[PDB]
């Protein structure tokens, strides 16, 4: 139904202008509105168009920032996202109003980041098995993916081979203003010494790749 | 303007689920939930704390008056463990809860605990360090405290858990020391200890550079 | 309520008309040397004529009020540097109270010319960082007009802020600082803007501040 | 006309303020008292030393005769750490009261301290400002010493203390030392001496 | 009827927010514009908007930059200009629409200055009367005033005494950016070696005052 | 969008004042007229061009149709020698003329001229501006030329003209160049010529 | 009526999805294509879709490389680029066909960037002036797309940029020089605003004669 | 397949111009021309050859047949001052010509050239980059050689050529000398030396 764009990141007292198009419900039979969630947060309501022309509502914490209109034509929502700041960073999604009550339908969600950080790619440490991270016959072994400040990393083992007892943890931003990430997968012990196991790291934003060895 | 409540709501796979949302002030209105799973929009549960959203199983049901309202489920699948969220409509705004995380029961499991030295790059680098791995552990009480030299450490660790993992059963847990690359080389020895329900003690693991 | 100007830096002898428009309804002005205390200086009653004046500006200072304009009026004349102080504008509640008070205007008598703010900041370096926390910042100095408005990266960084008044040098000019504490995690990593805003020199300096320590 | 007193009161959050206003004239009327925040205009507490302003809350109450006269503030909160005036009426002028000021009282700590070298366009222009920054302390008691090769400074520095905060309720300080860049080149080891409740032995913080 | 503000000296890229307040009118009744006046230009209509609110129009000139909005609780309009460019520098003035094709009401105006040149007060440079610049009975003396960010710049011969023959020139701008002005008299030639004149320079915005003394410095 | 012709109109007091608006666009609609003096904003004289507007004396009128208009005033008095401009509408879009200034008319005359070479202080400065002075001329159609050893100058010079003095109702102007220290001192001889209605021959004024 | 995105950089051997939504004319009552031009290239056609279903059409140096489909309910034009070489650098077009001969309407143009090189911002170094002209050169930011101007465009005239060239690093070099009064300097500075938009970077340089 | 001809074109604005479509290839079919300005994505100009496309003035007029055709522009305007391209479908695939672009003509005129040493910043990063500016030079033409202790260097520099600009049709070009910071320290004069048909001997400008 739903699908979004527009985001990215910004310089604080930047602008960044987001949208979402929808295929499916008539757009311009439905009231659309806009919903934020910082990370590690709950939801937020930002602001909403009422069903019909203007009628235009914001929430306390976003304005003299946060402009919006809807185009019935490109049967697509519009936020104006302007003098930004870092409270403002969050997953936006687009949503379809049941009435004046309820959000019947959401997008995907689109990320918007305000940070005087600039765009930095990976590097990546691994955390080896070695002698002293194996106990028996289970093994711990991983990476640690560390001083990106772009959240959407992705990471798999062994070229996306290996998912069994893999696990990797939420990105969490750092005091430096940039993000990390662990990522770890037990293994039997018996494999170590004749498996290598491949940490693959993707970081989109950056245009960064990096494959490591850990054993 | 509402509050949810229980913080943490943990079921069994088949028990009944009660989610709460209560008066901070009058807002008298029918208020609608939401779920939400991590990398994902939230979607609708009911059309009101009367009502259920098409698509939603009918196990879901919303209830309540005035400004005081439940959500209970008869009873919930592994796929219904999400975090659910309020919605009331106050003068023109739209308001969300904090909302009340619902996790999967199942027994208590000690954490396998791993300790993973700093690598040689972060050394070269200037930086360093250590990462306390605690895997397939149930419930997310864990209590991880690092120590260097056995001085009890605060405030230069990070702390990331994952979600009950269908596989592991369970949750992992990374618990990061940060260090310059001076304060791992002044000290010796690195441990930490970890608190947990299924363990008898606390267990230390440790490692000398 | 009480909206007032018409301050300003003149050379002692000379004069300045000063002026507040007001909503509602006896008015006065009240004034406060830096450091001071209130002073009243002259009212004026509801109606028409009927003002009081203190006896430390009879003779220099006349009060009236335009009943059309709904604008108080004070005029000063031959000022003293003794006569600097924040003019406050108030509204009078019977014959006890002052109910209302505009913001404040400063009016500033001195033989010095109007100077702009050179600003030279405080690098963090390296070895004044202790621990996670970092004190960086800028000296503003060398501006006659003591008011100096300073923030930081445009207004997006507010805590951990601090900002020391300003002080009078030997050479008649003053002197301010601004300096802030940060992670020092993020050094290296961000940078931070000081603003320097002089309206009365029309000065506008915008500082980068970096850990300017070891080549 | 009237004089109050103490000039600094020195109170917890929770705590039971009064102020007083001295006797110094045979004015008898009832006065009225008036609170200033830093940077702002002062606002009116109560229509006379027997009511209360419209809109304050129940807390503050004036109260006495003649002559002489108390403010109370049954409790304090944060929004009462101000200046407080007293104002009367004689014969047709409007009279305003030194005033005094109530700090909040808080545990003791010493500040952290930082220093400043001089910048190399500061250099450039010709002056040298060191400076030394305290922050984050309690009480302003701070004693602030510049050094220059182990030689006293005195009668070179500048000293700027900001107000209490609105969150921790501690001070800040800025000590600027001022050299000349000749005398910045003259010598080479700058420090700065701190001796603060808080700190135990002075605290001394250098650069080159 | 309009009393406006809110103008002085903004950076290049900067803004300011003008506004006016009107009186003797219901402002909801009536529509309005703003209108600005470089120096030695005519007028340009720079924005409105119709009485009640919405359906503002702007100037191509100022798009993108400038926002035009009132508020009917404040009997105020008011004018966001930003982006500020050089060529936005003039005298705004408010104005109340007749119907929708003439203005009947004028505010006073204000100023707005756009510059990157900071505030400096004026230098003065005596033009002698000499005995070159001088012409049977007449000689002209006088004082070039220069260098002066601001231009507001006021000039009085003899501290007011000399109120005739005095030809003071508007203020041009250099390319510097920095303004200058002429200020000359013309006396009897039989008043040099005499009569000493002084040239009184006074620039408020600067705290600046300058008494030369003109003299025939042939 | 519509031009005004005269681009200058002179007349003496009491004397018939006719002003012209016309076609660049065709855009047919009434326009308003209105007039400046030097310091004040524009002051509305017809409600349009088919009625007066109120207040102003019953010598003004407008008139015209379509895409063409004049202004007309019977019979001029000393206040209504000001700027006056002409107002139109496009659709949504307000516009102004250019506008044509009433000049006094008064007896043609030459400029008394001088030539002010630099100051000291002004070349110990590192400038050397030099002034040409015309003074009392009629009417303002002066044209002022710098030369440097008699070369023509041109793009380092400016021109300041006063408003007619409405008691002589001569002009003023003063014609500025501005060289360089360094300039100044390359060069050795500094003229300027003046060329007007009221003289024979362009005058000119020089020195070193 | 050609709304199109979806660029960015992209590794050797990765991939990208393109997209372009219709505004005006009915998506589904013609044929699509899209057409890229390398920098310091003329206009090479990649693909396109017929009106009705399938029909699809590839230029041969992108066979096996590219798929272009449409979504007739979403108004949207589509092409996935896989496999992508250096040689795919180019800002793609969307264009509307008129009937088999020409295409008459082009939508806005969209940057894609295949290279081994990550993301990276500028650094600026301003070129002091000592009419006299100043400005700032700004370098070493691989990404192609860098805006520079003066005064936040305020200072609009007089201005000169010069399109980024290469140096042997395989990052781009960039210069901006604006021509003012040479009586201006020691008066007035100039700020140089210069934004790197993919690798987030802003810098503000103060230009001083020197 | 077809290739275009002249490779360049220059035209004053009213004048008259063509850009020929020859034959490479045996094709037989009627084609369309497009425009594209720098910055911007193409536009039809003409349904194929017979045709113009909506919007576009009868100035512009496409004819020819079979394998090779001709674009005729009555008159150009500086709008039209763009490269052409022509289209054809062959077989089935969409095929694009190289395209040419039209000149905006204007007389000959040298540069006016700077050169801008390397800041503190440039040198302490371990780059010297220095840079040679020629400004508004036509035709596009110049020649930028440095020099370093008069020794010759080329292989060592980029230039940048900005399109003629709309106003005055002509060009700027920054020609920019990388050197190590090591580099810069061991040589002392840096010079640039610019040929120019404007000009009647290089013009060379410096700094050490």
């Known amino acids: 139904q739903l699908l979004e764009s527009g985001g990215g990141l910004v310089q604080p007292g930047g602008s960044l202008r987001l949208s979402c198009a929808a295929s499916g419900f008539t757009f311009t039979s439905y009231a659309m509105s806009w919903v934020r969630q910082a990370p590690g947060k709950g939801l937020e309501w930002?602001?909403?168009?009422?069903?019909?022309?203007?009628?235009?509502?914001?929430?306390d914490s976003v304005k003299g920032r946060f402009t919006i209109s809807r185009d019935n034509s490109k049967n697509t929502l519009y936020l104006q996202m302007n003098s930004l700041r870092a409270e403002d960073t969050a997953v936006?999604?687009?949503?379809?109003?049941?009435?004046?009550?309820?959000?019947?339908?959401?997008?995907?969600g689109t990320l918007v980041t305000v940070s005087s950080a600039s765009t930095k790619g990976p590097s990546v440490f691994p955390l080896a098995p070695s002698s002293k991270s194996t106990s028996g016959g289970t093994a711990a072994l991983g990476c640690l993916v560390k001083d990106y400040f772009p959240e959407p990393v992705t990471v798999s083992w062994n070229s996306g081979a290996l998912t069994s007892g893999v696990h990797t943890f939420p990105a969490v931003l750092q005091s430096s203003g940039l993000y990390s990430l662990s990522s770890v997968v037990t293994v039997p012990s018996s494999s170590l010494g004749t498996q290598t196991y491949i940490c693959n790291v993707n970081h989109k934003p950056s245009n960064t790749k990096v494959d490591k060895k850990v054993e | 303007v509402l509050t949810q409540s229980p913080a943490t709501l943990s079921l069994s796979p088949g028990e009944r689920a009660t989610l709460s949302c209560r008066a901070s002030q009058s807002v008298s209105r029918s208020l609608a939930w939401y779920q939400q799973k991590p990398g994902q929009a939230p979607r609708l549960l009911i059309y009101g704390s009367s009502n259920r959203a098409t698509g939603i199983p009918a196990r879901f049901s919303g209830s309540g008056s005035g400004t005081d309202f439940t959500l209970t489920i008869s009873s919930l699948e592994p796929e219904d463990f999400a975090v659910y969220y309020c919605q009331q409509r106050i003068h023109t705004s739209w308001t969300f809860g904090q909302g009340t995380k619902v996790e999967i029961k199942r027994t208590v499991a000690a954490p396998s605990v791993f300790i993973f030295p700093p690598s040689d790059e972060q050394l070269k680098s200037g930086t360093a360090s250590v990462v306390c791995l605690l895997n397939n552990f149930y419930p997310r009480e864990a209590k991880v405290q690092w120590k260097v030299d056995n001085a009890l450490q605060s405030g230069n660790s990070q702390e990331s858990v994952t979600e009950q993992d269908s596989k592991d059963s369970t949750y992992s847990l990374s618990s990061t020391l940060t260090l310059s690359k001076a304060d791992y080389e002044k000290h010796k020895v690195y441990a930490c200890e970890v608190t947990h329900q299924g363990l008898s003690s606390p267990v230390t693991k440790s490692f000398n550079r | 309520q009480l909206l007032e100007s018409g301050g300003g830096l003149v050379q002692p002898g000379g004069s300045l008309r000063l002026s507040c428009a007001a909503s509602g309804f006896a008015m006065s002005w009240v004034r406060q040397a830096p450091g001071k205390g209130l002073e009243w200086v002259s009212g004026?009653?509801?109606?028409?004529?009927?003002?009081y004046y203190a006896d430390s500006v009879k003779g220099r200072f006349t009060i009236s009020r335009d009943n059309s304009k709904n604008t108080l009026y004070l005029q000063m004349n031959s000022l003293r540097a003794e006569d600097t102080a924040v003019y406050y504008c108030?509204?009078?509640?019977?014959?006890?109270?002052?109910?209302?008070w505009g913001q404040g205007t400063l009016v500033t008598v001195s033989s010095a010319s109007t100077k702009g703010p050179s600003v030279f900041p405080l690098a963090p370096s390296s070895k004044s960082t202790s621990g996670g926390t970092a004190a960086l910042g800028c000296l503003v100095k060398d501006y006659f007009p003591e008011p100096v408005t300073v923030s930081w990266n445009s207004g997006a960084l507010t805590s951990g802020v601090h900002t020391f008044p300003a002080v009078l040098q030997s050479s008649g000019l003053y002197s301010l600082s601004s300096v802030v504490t940060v992670p020092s995690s993020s050094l290296g990593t961000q940078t931070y803007i000081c603003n320097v805003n002089h309206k009365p020199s029309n000065t506008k300096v915008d500082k980068k501040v970096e850990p300017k320590s070891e080549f | 006309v009237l004089t109050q007193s103490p000039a600094t009161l020195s109170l917890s959050p929770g705590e039971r303020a009064t102020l007083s206003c001295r006797a110094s004239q045979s004015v008898s009327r009832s006065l009225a008292w008036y609170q200033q925040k830093p940077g702002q205009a002062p606002r009116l507490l109560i229509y006379g030393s027997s009511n209360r302003a419209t809109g304050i809350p129940a807390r503050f109450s004036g109260s006495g005769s003649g002559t002489d006269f108390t403010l109370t503030i049954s409790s304090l909160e944060p929004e009462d750490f101000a200046v407080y005036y007293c104002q009367q009426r004689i014969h047709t002028s409007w009279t305003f009261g030194q005033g005094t000021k109530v700090e909040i009282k808080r545990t003791v700590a010493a500040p952290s301290v930082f220093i400043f070298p001089p910048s190399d366009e500061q250099l450039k222009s010709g002056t040298a400002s060191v400076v030394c920054l305290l922050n984050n302390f309690y009480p302003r008691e701070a004693k602030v010493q510049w050094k220059v090769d182990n030689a006293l400074q005195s009668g070179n520095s500048q000293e700027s203390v900001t107000e209490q905060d609105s969150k921790d309720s501690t001070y800040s300080l800025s000590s600027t030392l001022t050299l000349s860049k000749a005398d910045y080149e003259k010598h080479k080891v700058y420090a700065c001496e701190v001796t603060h409740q808080g700190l135990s032995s002075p605290v001394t913080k250098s650069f080159n | 009827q309009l009393l406006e503000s809110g103008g002085g000296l903004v950076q290049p890229g900067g803004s300011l927010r003008l506004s006016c307040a009107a009186s003797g009118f219901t402002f909801t009744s009536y529509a309005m514009s703003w209108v600005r006046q470089a120096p030695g230009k005519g007028l340009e209509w720079?924005?409105?908007?119709?009485?009640?609110?919405?359906?503002?129009?702007?100037?191509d000139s100022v798009k993108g930059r400038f926002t035009i909005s009132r508020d009917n609780s404040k009997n105020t309009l008011y004018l966001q200009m930003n982006s500020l460019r050089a060529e936005d520098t003039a005298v705004?003035?408010?104005?109340?629409?007749?119907?929708?094709?003439?203005?009947?009401?004028?505010?006073?105006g204000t100023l707005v200055t756009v510059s990157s040149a900071s505030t400096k007060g004026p230098s003065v440079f005596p033009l002698a009367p000499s005995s070159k610049s001088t012409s049977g009975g007449t000689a002209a003396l006088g004082c070039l005033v220069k260098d002066y960010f601001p231009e507001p710049v006021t000039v009085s011969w003899n501290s007011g005494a000399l109120t005739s023959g005095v030809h003071t020139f508007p203020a041009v701008l250099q390319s510097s950016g920095l303004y200058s002005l002429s200020s000359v008299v013309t006396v009897p030639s039989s008043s040099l070696g005499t009569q000493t004149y002084i040239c009184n320079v006074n620039h408020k915005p600067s705290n600046t005052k300058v008494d030369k003394k003109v003299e025939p410095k042939s | 969008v519509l031009t005004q012709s005269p681009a200058t109109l002179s007349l003496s007091p009491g004397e018939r004042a006719t002003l012209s608006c016309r076609a660049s666009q065709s855009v047919s609609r009434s326009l308003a007229w209105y007039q400046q003096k030097p310091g004040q904003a524009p002051r509305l004289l017809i409600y349009g061009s088919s009625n007066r507007a109120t207040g102003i004396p019953a010598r003004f009128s407008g008139s015209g149709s379509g895409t063409d208009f004049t202004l007309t005033i019977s019979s001029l008095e000393p206040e209504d020698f000001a700027v006056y401009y002409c107002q139109q509408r496009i659709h949504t879009s307000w516009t102004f003329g250019q506008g044509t200034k009433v000049e006094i008319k008064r007896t043609v005359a030459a400029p008394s001229v001088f030539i002010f070479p630099p100051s000291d202080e002004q070349l110990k400065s590192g400038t050397a501006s030099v002034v040409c002075l015309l003074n009392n001329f009629y009417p303002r159609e002066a044209k002022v030329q710098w030369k440097v050893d008699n070369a023509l100058q041109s793009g380092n010079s400016q021109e300041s003209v006063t408003e007619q003095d409405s008691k002589d109702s001569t002009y003023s102007l003063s014609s500025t160049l501005t060289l360089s220290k360094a300039d100044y001192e390359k060069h050795k001889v500094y003229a300027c010529e003046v060329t007007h209605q009221g003289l024979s021959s362009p005058v000119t004024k020089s020195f070193n | 009526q050609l709304l199109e995105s979806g660029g960015g950089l992209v590794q050797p051997g990765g991939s990208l999805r393109l997209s372009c939504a219709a505004s005006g004319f009915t998506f589904t009552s013609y044929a699509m294509s899209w057409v890229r031009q390398a920098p310091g290239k003329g206009l090479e056609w990649?693909?396109?879709?017929?009106?009705?279903?399938?029909?699809?059409?590839?230029?041969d140096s992108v066979k096996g490389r590219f798929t272009i489909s449409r979504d007739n309910s979403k108004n949207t034009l589509y092409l996935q680029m896989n496999s992508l070489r250096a040689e795919d650098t180019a800002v793609?077009?969307?264009?509307?066909?008129?009937?088999?001969?020409?295409?008459?309407?082009?939508?806005?143009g969209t940057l894609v960037t295949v290279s081994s090189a990550s993301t990276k911002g500028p650094s600026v170094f301003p070129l002091a002036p000592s009419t006299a002209a100043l400005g700032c050169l700004v370098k070493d930011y691989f990404p192609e797309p860098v805006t520079v101007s003066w005064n936040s465009g305020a200072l609009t005239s007089g201005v000169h940029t010069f399109p980024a060239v290469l140096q042997s690093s395989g990052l781009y070099s960039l210069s901006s020089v604006v021509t003012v009064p040479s009586s201006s300097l020691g008066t007035q500075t100039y700020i140089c605003n210069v934004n790197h938009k993919p690798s987030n970077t802003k810098v503000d340089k103060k230009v001083e004669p020197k | 397949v077809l290739t275009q001809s002249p490779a360049t074109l220059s035209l004053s604005p009213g004048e008259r111009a063509t850009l020929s479509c020859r034959a490479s290839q045996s094709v037989s079919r009627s084609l369309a021309w497009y425009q594209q300005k720098p910055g911007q994505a193409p536009r039809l100009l003409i349904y194929g050859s017979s045709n113009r496309a909506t919007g576009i003035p009868a100035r512009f007029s496409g004819s020819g047949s079979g394998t090779d055709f001709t674009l005729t522009i009555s008159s150009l305007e500086p709008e039209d001052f763009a490269v052409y391209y022509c289209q054809q479908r062959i077989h089935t695939s969409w095929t694009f010509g190289q395209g040419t672009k039209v000149e905006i003509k204007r007389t000959v005129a040298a540069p006016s050239v700077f050169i801008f040493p390397p800041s503190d910043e440039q040198l302490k990063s371990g780059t010297a980059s220095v840079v040679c500016l020629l400004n508004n030079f036509y035709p596009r033409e110049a020649k930028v050689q440095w020099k370093v202790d008069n020794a010759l260097q080329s292989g060592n520099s980029q230039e940048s050529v900005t399109e003629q600009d709309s106003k005055d049709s002509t060009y700027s070009l920054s020609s920019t000398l990388t050197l190590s910071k090591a580099d810069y320290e061991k040589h002392k004069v840096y010079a640039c030396e610019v040929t120019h048909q404007g000009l009647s001997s290089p013009v060379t400008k410096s700094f050490n």
């Open positions: 004026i009653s509801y109606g028409s004529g009927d003002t």
């Open positions: 108030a509204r009078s509640r019977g014959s006890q109270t002052f109910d209302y």
